């Protein structure tokens, strides 16, 4: 289900650590599944994300805001992945055909481990035509 993807794919422990929160939202902004601590995102934030996927670099000067919190944009994949850092944590956002997979991490988990779980699920949904 969309909820087993969140709980079993995204929240699966990678080297003992797991995401602080995860979710799959439809690109219209609606939540299909989310973990318990996932943030309430604003409309304008979901819009900035979609705009950065069309015009990469759109978010860098201003920051990646999620839940009213600022993230500093870090290197991603054009039109495919947006990554950010906020102190010892960060977030990875993977764009699929119909969705947006989000992954929030906090130390001791690393960015590489968050990228791994988030992007692999994203490539799996993309394969299933989602």
Resolution in A: 2.2
> 102 forms bridges with which residues in the sheet?
23, 93
46-55 in b/e form (b: 16+ CB < 10 A) is bebbeebbee
Strands (E), 17-121: 21-26, 31-34, 64-66, 69-77, 81-86, 89-95, 99-106
- Cβ atoms of 100 and 118 closer than 8 Å: no
Which among 8, 2, 7 has a CA at the least distance from the CA of 30? 2
d(CA 57, CA 53): 9
Output the six-digit token pair for 10.
């995204």
Query: Options 3.30.450.30, 3.40.50.1100, 1.10.3720.10, 3.30.110.30; which CATH number does 1-130 get?
Result: 3.30.450.30
> 71 forms bridges with which residues in the sheet?
64
- Cβ atoms of 86 and 69 closer than 8 Å: yes
Which among 117, 73, 113 has a CA at the least distance from the CA of 94? 117
């Amino acid at each position: 289900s969309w909820q087993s993807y969140v709980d079993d794919h995204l929240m699966c422990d990678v080297e003992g650590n797991h995401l602080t929160a995860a979710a799959i939202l439809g690109q219209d902004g609606s939540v299909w599944a989310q973990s318990a601590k996932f943030p309430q995102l604003k409309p304008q934030e979901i819009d900035g994300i979609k705009k950065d996927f069309e015009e990469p670099g759109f978010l860098a000067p201003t920051g990646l805001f999620l839940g009213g919190e600022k993230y500093m944009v870090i290197q991603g994949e054009q039109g495919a992945v947006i990554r950010g850092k906020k102190g010892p944590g960060g977030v990875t956002i993977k764009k699929t055909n119909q969705a947006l997979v989000f992954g929030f991490y906090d130390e001791p988990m690393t960015g590489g481990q968050c990228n791994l779980v988030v992007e692999r699920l994203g490539d799996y949904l993309i394969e299933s035509e989602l």
